[PDB]
Amino acid sequence: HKILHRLLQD
Amino acid sequence: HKILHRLLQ
Amino acid sequence: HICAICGDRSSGKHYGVYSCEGCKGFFKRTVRKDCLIDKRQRNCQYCRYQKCLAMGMKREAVQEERANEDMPVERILEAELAVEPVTNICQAADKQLFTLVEWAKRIPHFSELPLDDQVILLRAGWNELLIASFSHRSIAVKDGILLATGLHVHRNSAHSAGVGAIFDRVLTELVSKMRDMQMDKTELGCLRAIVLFNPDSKGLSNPAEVEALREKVYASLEAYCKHKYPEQPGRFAKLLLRLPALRSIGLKCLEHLFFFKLIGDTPIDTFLMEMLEA
Amino acid sequence: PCFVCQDKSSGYHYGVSACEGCKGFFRRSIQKNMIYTCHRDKNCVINKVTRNRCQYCRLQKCFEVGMSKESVRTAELDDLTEKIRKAHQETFPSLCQLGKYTTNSSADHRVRLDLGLWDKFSELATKCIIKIVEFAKRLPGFTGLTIADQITLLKAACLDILILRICTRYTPEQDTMTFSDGLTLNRTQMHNAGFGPLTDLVFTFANQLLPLEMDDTETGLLSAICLICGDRQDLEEPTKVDKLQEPLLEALKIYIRKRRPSKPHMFPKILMKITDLRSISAKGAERVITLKMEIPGSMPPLIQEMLE
DNA sequence: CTAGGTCAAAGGTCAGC
DNA sequence: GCTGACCTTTGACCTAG
Ligand SMILES: CC1=C(/C=C/C(C)=C\C=C\C(C)=C\C(=O)O)C(C)(C)CCC1
Ligand SMILES: CC1=C(/C=C/C(C)=C\C=C\C(C)=C\C(=O)O)C(C)(C)CCC1
Ligand SMILES: [Zn+2]
Ligand SMILES: [Zn+2]
Ligand SMILES: [Zn+2]
Ligand SMILES: [Zn+2]
C-alpha cells in the first residue's frame, strides 16, 4: 500500500 | 576432478 | 644550477631564466591575471616581479589557458548516529525498517528528489541496507549477530531452521571482513549511501540525478579515505568490493523471505510484508 | 601546411601532412588508448594559437583530416598491468581481430533449445573454459598457490569471466555477440543456443558496458580481480588471496585514471559492474541445472565440472 | 623520408599555512 | 587565496630501416 509513502509523508 | 589436476600439473 | 631570482634549487630554464618552481608559478599567474629576494624572503610584487623581468623572464613565453562540500562525510557521520530465530530476525527487520525510512531523510539530497523516486530507491535495496546495518553492528561478537532488539543469534540455534548457510555467508563475507579491516561508521554510511542511490532501479523517474548523487558519494568517500587512511593505498577499492558480496547475500536472503512468505508459516509484520510485495 | 592546426609540416605523417606536435599527439593518443572529453560544444577550432583547449577536439580534427589509426604501431605496479594485458590478449582474441561469420539455425524467433547450436556452443564453451584456466595460469603468483584454492577460485569465477568476455564481444548496431572462432549470433540465436532467461539480462549487461569504454587491459585486470577474490568460500589461504588481489585493484585504478583525465570517477563504476556480474553468474549457475534435463545426451565434462 | 623514442620545458593540481 | 613541491604533457630533435 502506502505505508512507507505515509511514513515519509510527515 | 581429473581435468583440473591434469591441466594444472 | 641555482635559481637566478631567489637562489633556490633549479631543474632548468623557465621563460628564459634559470629559476625555481615558486618564481615560475608566480610569474605565470602574474602574467595571466595581469627588497632582497632569496628563498628565505621571496614572499612586494615589484621586487619579486621586477627581478623576474630584470633577469630576463619573457611574458610572451606564457601560453594561453589550457570531506567535500555537496556530499560531505559530515552528513553521514550525523546519519549513522541519528538512527543507530527467523521470526526474531523478521521482527528486528521490521523495527529497523522505520529507522531506515528515517535514515533516508538525513542524506543531503535525498529529500529534494521526487515522490516516486523516494519509494523506489528505498524499497529497492532495503535488505542490503539493513544487512549492512547489523553486519557492521556484529563486529564485537564472534560467531553471532546482534539485532536491533538486543538479541544475540548464533551457532546451531541460528542454524536450526535450515537457515545456517546464509548466516555463515553474512558472518564470513561481511562481518569478519568488516572487523578485519576495521571499517568506520562513516565508511559504512557511505557504502549504504551507494546502495541507496541505485540508478539501475526499475521505474525510476529521471535516475540521472540519483546516479549523480552516487558519483558525489564515490568522490567524497574516496577523498575521506585519502585523509583518514593515507597509509592504506587501496582503502577505497577494497571497501567498494564489499558491495558484490552484499548483493549476492541479499539475493538468496530475500528469496528465503519469499518462500517463507508464500508458505504462510512465519508471522511477518505488515511493514516488512510490504517490501516483499511489490 | 598542417591539416589539423595550420602549422609548418614536417612530412606526411600517418596519412596526411602534419607538424611534429600533432604527430606526437596522435601517436601518444593511439598508443595509450586515450579517452578525451571536451568541456565545450566539441566545436573548439584548433589552429596555431588555439591548440589544446580541448584534446577531444584536436584528436577529432586528426580523424576528420584523415589520420590513420591503423598506421600506429609507478613502473613497479605497471609491470603486472602489462603482464595481464598480454595474458588476456593471448587467451581471448579481441572482437576486431576475428573474421566473423554467421549461421541460420533457429535464427528468427525463439525456441526452447536448438540441439546443434547447443552442440557448437558446447564445444566453444569448453574451449573458452580451457583458455580461462590458461589466463589464470599466466597471472602473477596464481601458479604458486594451493591447488584446492586455485580450483576454488576458478570454480567460483568461471561464469563471471565468461559473461564479461562474451559481453566484450557485443555489437550494438546488430545486437549480436561473437565467439572465439568468429561465430556471430543474434539475441534470438543466443537464446535458442541455451541462454534462455539469462539472455535478456546478459545483453543488458553488455549495454551497461558500452558507456564505460573498457579496453583489453581493463577487461583483463577486471577478470583477474573477479578471479582473485578473498571472499570465496572453502578457501584454505584466503588472506593471501586478498593480498594477491590488492595490487590488481591499485593497478586497475592507476590505469583507468591514466587513460581518463577528465573522468576520474570511472574506476568505482567499472569496479562496481562486478555487483551485477555476481547476480548474472549466480542465476546462470542454476541455468545449467535447468539445461541438464533439456539435453538428450549429457553435459560436457569441463562445463559441469567447472559449473558444479 | 617517415616511423618510434627522448627529455627540457611548458602545463596542471592542491595540502598547508 | 596565494604559494610551491610534485606530477603530466608537449614538441623539436634524433636514429634506423
Ligand atoms: C540476513 C538474515 C535475514 C534477513 C534480514 C533482513 C531482510 C533485514 C534485517 C534487519 C535487521 C535484523 C537489522 C538489525 O539487526 O538492526 C533472514 C530473515 C533471511 C534470516 C537470516 C538473517
Ligand atoms: C558455459 C555456458 C554458459 C554461459 C556462457 C557464457 C556466459 C559465455 C560464453 C562465452 C564463450 C563460450 C566465449 C567464447 O566462445 O570464447 C551458460 C550459463 C549459458 C550455460 C551453458 C554453458
Ligand atoms: Zn626562485
Ligand atoms: Zn618592495
Ligand atoms: Zn599540427
Ligand atoms: Zn573542445
Numbering used by the authors:
A (entry chain C): 687 to 696
B (entry chain D): 687 to 695
C (entry chain A): 133 to 166, 177 to 185, 187 to 209, 226 to 243, 264 to 457
D (entry chain B): 80 to 152, 174 to 408
Quoted passage from the original study:
Using extensive crystallization screens that utilized various sized DBD–hinge–LBD segments of each isotype of RXRs and RARs, and a variety of known RAR ligands, we successfully obtained crystals of only the RARβ–RXRα heterodimer on a DR1 DNA in the presence of REA and 9CR retinoic acids, and with LXXLL synthetic peptides derived from SRC-2′s second (middle) NR box. The DBD and LBD of RARβ are physically connected; however, the corresponding two domains of RXRα are spatially displaced from each other without any physical contacts between them, and each of these domains locates on the opposite side of the double-strand DNA. Furthermore, we could not observe ordered electron density for the hinge region connecting those two RXRα domains, suggesting this region remains flexible and disordered. A series of inter-subunit domain–domain interactions are clearly formed between RARβ and RXRα, involving LBD–LBD and DBD–DBD interfaces, with the latter forming directly atop the DR1 DNA, as we previously described. But in the case of RARβ, a well-formed interface is observed to physically connect the DBD and LBD segments of the polypeptide. This interface is mainly established via the DBD’s loop immediately following α1 helix, and the LBD’s loop between its α9 and α10 helices. In addition to two hydrogen bonds formed between R359 and main-chain atoms of N112 and I114, hydrophobic contacts also contribute to the interactions at this interface. The observed polarity of the complex on DR1 is established with RAR binding on the upstream AGGTCA DNA half-site and RXR binding on the downstream half-site.
